[PDB]
Amino acid sequence: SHHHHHSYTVTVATGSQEHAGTDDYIYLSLVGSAGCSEKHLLDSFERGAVDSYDVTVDEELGEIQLVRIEKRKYGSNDDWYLKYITLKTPHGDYIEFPCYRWITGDVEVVLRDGRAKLARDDQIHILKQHRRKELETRQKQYRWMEWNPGFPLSIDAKCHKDLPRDIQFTISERVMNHWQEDLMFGYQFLNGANPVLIRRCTELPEKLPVTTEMVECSLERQLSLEQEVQQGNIFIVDFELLDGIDQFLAAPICLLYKNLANKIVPIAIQLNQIPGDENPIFLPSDAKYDWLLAKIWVRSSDFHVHQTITHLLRTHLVSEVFGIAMYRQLPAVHPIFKLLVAHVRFTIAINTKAREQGGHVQMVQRAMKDLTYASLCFPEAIKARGMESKEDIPYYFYRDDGLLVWEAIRTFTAEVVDIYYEGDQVVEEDPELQDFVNDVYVYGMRGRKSSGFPKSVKSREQLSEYLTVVIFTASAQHAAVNFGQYDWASWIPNAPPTMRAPPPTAKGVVTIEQIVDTLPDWALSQFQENELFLGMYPEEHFIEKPVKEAMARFRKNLEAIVSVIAERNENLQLPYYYLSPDRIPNSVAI
Ligand SMILES: [Fe+2]
Numbered sequence: 001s002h003h004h005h006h007s008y009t010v011t012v013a014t015g016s017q018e019h020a021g022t023d024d025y026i027y028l029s030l031v032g033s034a035g036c037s038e039k040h041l042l043d044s045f046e047r048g049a050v051d052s053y054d055v056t057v058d059e060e061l062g063e064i065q066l067v068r069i070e071k072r073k074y075g076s077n078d079d080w081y082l083k084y085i086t087l088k089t090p091h092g093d094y095i096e097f098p099c100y101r102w103i104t105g106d107v108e109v110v111l112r113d114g115r116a117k118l119a120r121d122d123q124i125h126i127l128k129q130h131r132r133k134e135l136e137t138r139q140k141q142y143r144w145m146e147w148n149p150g151f152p153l154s155i156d157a158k159c160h161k162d163l164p165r166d167i168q169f170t171i172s173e174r175v176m177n178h179w180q181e182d183l184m185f186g187y188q189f190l191n192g193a194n195p196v197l198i199r200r201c202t203e204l205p206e207k208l209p210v211t212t213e214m215v216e217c218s219l220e221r222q223l224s225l226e227q228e229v230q231q232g233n234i235f236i237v238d239f240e241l242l243d244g245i246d247q248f249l250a251a252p253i254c255l256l257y258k259n260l261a262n263k264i265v266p267i268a269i270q271l272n273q274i275p276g277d278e279n280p281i282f283l284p285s286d287a288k289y290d291w292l293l294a295k296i297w298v299r300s301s302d303f304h305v306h307q308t309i310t311h312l313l314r315t316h317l318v319s320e321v322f323g324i325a326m327y328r329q330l331p332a333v334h335p336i337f338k339l340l341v342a343h344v345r346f347t348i349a350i351n352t353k354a355r356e357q358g359g360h361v362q363m364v365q366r367a368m369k370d371l372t373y374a375s376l377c378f379p380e381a382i383k384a385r386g387m388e389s390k391e392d393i394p395y396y397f398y399r400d401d402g403l404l405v406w407e408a409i410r411t412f413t414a415e416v417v418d419i420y421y422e423g424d425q426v427v428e429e430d431p432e433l434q435d436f437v438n439d440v441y442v443y444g445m446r447g448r449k450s451s452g453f454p455k456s457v458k459s460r461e462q463l464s465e466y467l468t469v470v471i472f473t474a475s476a477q478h479a480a481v482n483f484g485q486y487d488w489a490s491w492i493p494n495a496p497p498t499m500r501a502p503p504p505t506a507k508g509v510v511t512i513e514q515i516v517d518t519l520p521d522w523a524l525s526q527f528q529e530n531e532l533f534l535g536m537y538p539e540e541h542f543i544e545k546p547v548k549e550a551m552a553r554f555r556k557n558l559e560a561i562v563s564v565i566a567e568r569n570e571n572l573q574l575p576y577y578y579l580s581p582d583r584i585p586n587s588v589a590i
Contacts, residue, residue: 002042006049007056009088014045015081015100021047022071022080024105028053029068030087031110031126032061039070045080057090064089065126066112067097071105079104079165084540085111098332100341100539102165107137114543116335116420118430134331135432142167142327144443147355150365152317153443155324160353167327169349171487174574179494182284185295186256186265187395189237191576193484193495194306195398198256198264200386201229201236208253209275210268217285218267220260232392233258239301241309241366243273245359248499252298262394269294271503278505289510296493296515297503303495306481308360309367315478318376319347319588321444322470329436335420336433338541339413339467342532343474346589371445373452376469378406378477397568398480401579404561405476405534406468408581412554413467417460419546428458437466475534479584486525496520524590527583534558534584558582 010028014020023044030037037057045051067085082099089095097111110130122128141164145156157163178184189198204210204226212225219228228234235256243251255268269282271294282294323344330337375381382388382399390400421427428434434456445451457463489495501518504510532538535555542548558581569575577583 001054003052004049005052006046007054007090010042010053010055011086012042012045012051012053013083013085014047014049014051015083016048017081018047019079020081021045021049022078022103024074024078024080025072026080027068027070027072028055028085029070030055030057030061030064031066031068032064033124033126034062035059037061060090063093064095064113065124066110066130069103069109069111071103073105077105082109084114096540096543098338098539098541098543100541102168104165110134112333114541115333116338116542116544116547117333118335118420118426119432120426120429131331131333135329138331139328142324144324144439148361148364150368150446151361152313152321152368152371152445153324154317154320154355155348155352157352159356160349163349163352167323167346167348169346169353171484171574172490175488175491175494179491180292182265183263185299186263187574188302188488188494189235189256190264190393190396191398191574193481193488194302194310195396195480196310197237197302197305198235198385198387199237200232201234201255202386204229204234204255205236205238205253207273207275208255208268208270208281210255210270210281214281214283215255215257215267218257218259218265218283228257232386235264237298237302239298239305240273241305241363242301245362247359248502249304249359250297250301250503252294252301254298258393264393264395266295266298269298271297280505280507282507286507287510289512289515290504290507293504293510293515293518296496296518297499299494300496300499303489303497304360304363308363310481311478313364313367314371314376315473315481316347316351316588318371318444319344319470319474319478320351321440322474323347325436325439325444329439330432332541334432335416335542335547336436336467339416340470341541342537342539343471343587345532345587347474347587350588350590368446368448369450371451373454373469376473377465378402378472397572397576398579400568401561401565401576402476402480404564405558405579405581405584406472408554408557408561409471409476410464410468411557412550413471414460414464415550415553416547417464417467419550421460421463424459427460427463428456433457433463474587476579476584478588480578482590483525483527483583484578486522490522492519526590527585528590531589532586534581534586536586 026042027039029039040055080103082103084099085097087095096114098114099111103109143156144153147154215225237254239251242249250271251273253270256264257267258264272279282290284291326340437457441453441455445453496519498520535558562580562582565580
C-alpha cells in the first residue's frame with residue numbers, strides 16, 4: 001500500500017519547483033552487498049509530494065549500497081525532479097540517499113547513501129565502479145569551451161537549452177540630492193557599488209604631474225603634498241586598464257586625500273594617462289562645471305570597470321570556473337561536492353543565458369593578468385592595496401564587513417575539512433580534489449603561471465583557504481558588487497552607462513549644456529522569494545551529524561555578524577548593508 005503525503009519502507013520526495021512532477025513509470029532497484037533486487041514499479045509523483053511505498057524483496061540483500069531509478073515514459077516524457085530517497089530496511093536501519101537532480105528518462109540515475117566518502121574509503125567493486133562511471137559521465141556532460149579569446153574557459157553550451165538538465169534554471173534618494181558633493185564622490189570608492197579599486201599611494205606617479213601648489217587649498221595639515229603621501233594620507237584610483245581601448249571612453253587618474261575628519265575626498269583628476277596641455281589636471285578649485293564634469297568621467301570609468309571586471313569577470317566567470325571544475329571532478333558523494341554545490345547553484349545557467357543574449361572583450365583580456373589567486377583572498381587583497389588599517393582608514397565598511405564574513409566562511413570550511421580529512425597527507429592524496437584544483441588552474445585559468453592558482457593542495461589549511469575563496473566569491477563578494485547597483489547607479493549622473501561627447505581638453509570652457517550633451521539621452525539588484533541566503537542549505541547533501549553541527553555553528557556566527565552590522569549601521573549617515581549575511585545569497589544567481 002502506497003501512502004502519499006503533501007520489507008523495505010521506501011520514501012520518495014519530489015521537488016517543489018514547477019514541472020518537478022512526473023506522470024511516468026518509475027522503477028526502483030536496490031543494490032546491496034549480497035545481491036540486487038528486481039525492478040519494482042511505483043504508481044503519479046506530484047510537485048511537492050512525498051510518496052511512500054512498502055517493497056518486499058525476493059532475497060536478503062545485506063547493507064544497501066546503491067539505489068537505482070529508471071523513468072520509462074507514460075505517454076510523453078515528463079522531467080522529474082527528485083529530492084531524495086530514504087529506506088527503512090528490514091533490519092531497522094534508516095538510510096538516506098540525497099539526489100537533487102532532474103531525471104529526464106535518458107539514463108538510469110544511481111545514488112550513493114548520503115554519508116560523504118573520499119575515494120580512499122571506497123574499496124569494494126560496487127562502489128569503485130559507481131564512482132568511476134559517475135566521473136566519466138560527468139566529464140562527457142560538463143566540458144570546457146573557449147567562448148571568447150583569452151577568457152576563462154566556460155561551459156561547452158551555445159544555448160541555455162543545451163546545458164545538462166541538472167544545471168539549468170533611500171540611498172537612491174540620497175544620491176540624487178548629493179551626487180555633486182566631493183564627499184559623496186569619495187565615499188563611493190569605499191562603500192558604493194564598486195569598492196575595490198582605491199589604493200594607498202606611496203609615491204606620486206610620474207604620469208600625474210600634480211604639485212603641492214595645485215592642491216594646497218585641499219590639504220589641511222600644513223604639510224606639502226609629497227609629505228602627505230609619505231604620511232599615508234594620499235590615495236589613488238587609476239583606470240589605466242581602460243587606456244588603449246579604441247562608445248567614447250577615457251582612462252582617468254583620480255587623486256584623493258584623507259582629510260582631518262578622516263574622510264577620503266577627491267583633490268585632483270586627470271582624465272587620461274599621458275599628461276599634456278590637452279589633458280589637464282582638474283581640481284576642486286576650478287570652475288564649478290570643469291570639476292563637476294571631470295568627476296562624471298571618473299564615475300563613467302568606475303561604472304565600466306565595475307560591470308565588466310569587478311562583477312562579470314571576477315565573480316561571475318570565476319564562480320563558473322569553480323562550478324565546472326566541481327561537476328567534472330568531484331562525485332556527488334565527495335564532501336567537497338556536498339559543500340560547494342549550493343554555492344555554484346545556477347551560476348553556469350545565469351552566465352549561459354547572458355552569453356546567448358569588442359572593447360568590453362579587451363577589458364577582460366587585459367584584466368586576466370590581474371586575476372590572481374591572492375587577489376581573491378579578501379584579507380590579503382585589502383592589504384595589497386594598503387587599505388587594511390582601520391585606525392588609519394575608518395570608514396571602509398566594505399572592508400570591515402567583508403573581513404567578518406570571510407573569517408566566518410573560513411571557520412566553517414576548516415571545521416568541514418577537519419571532519420573529513422584527518423591530516424595533511426589525506427588532502428594531498430585525494431585524487432579527485434587534486435584533479436578539481438588542477439582543472440581550475442589549467443582550463444579555467446588557462447594554465448597561466450602568473451595566476452598564482454595552486455596546481456595542487458597539500459594541507460588542510462590550504463584547502464580551507466581555497467574553499468573559502470570559492471564560497472566567498474560566489475556569495476559575499478558577488479552580493480557586495482551586485483546589490484548596490486540600484487542604490488548607486490540608478491541616478492545616471494552618478495553612473496553614466498555611455499558617454500556621448502569626448503572628455504573636455506581645456507579648463508574654463510565646459511557649460512552645463514556640454515555636461516548634458518555628454519550624458520546619455522534594477523533588474524539585477526533584486527532578491528527573489530525563493531532566494532537562499534548564506535548558510536541556508538535546504539538541499540540536504542550532507543546528512544551526517546558532525547557536519548550538520550558545523551553548519552549550525554556557521555549560521556549562529558553569521559547571525560552574530562548581522563547584529564554587529566545592524567548596530568554599526570544604526571549610527572551611520574548612510575547604512576552599508578550589502579554584506580549583512582541575511583542579504584548575501586549563497587550563489588551567483590542574478
Ligand atoms: Fe551578478
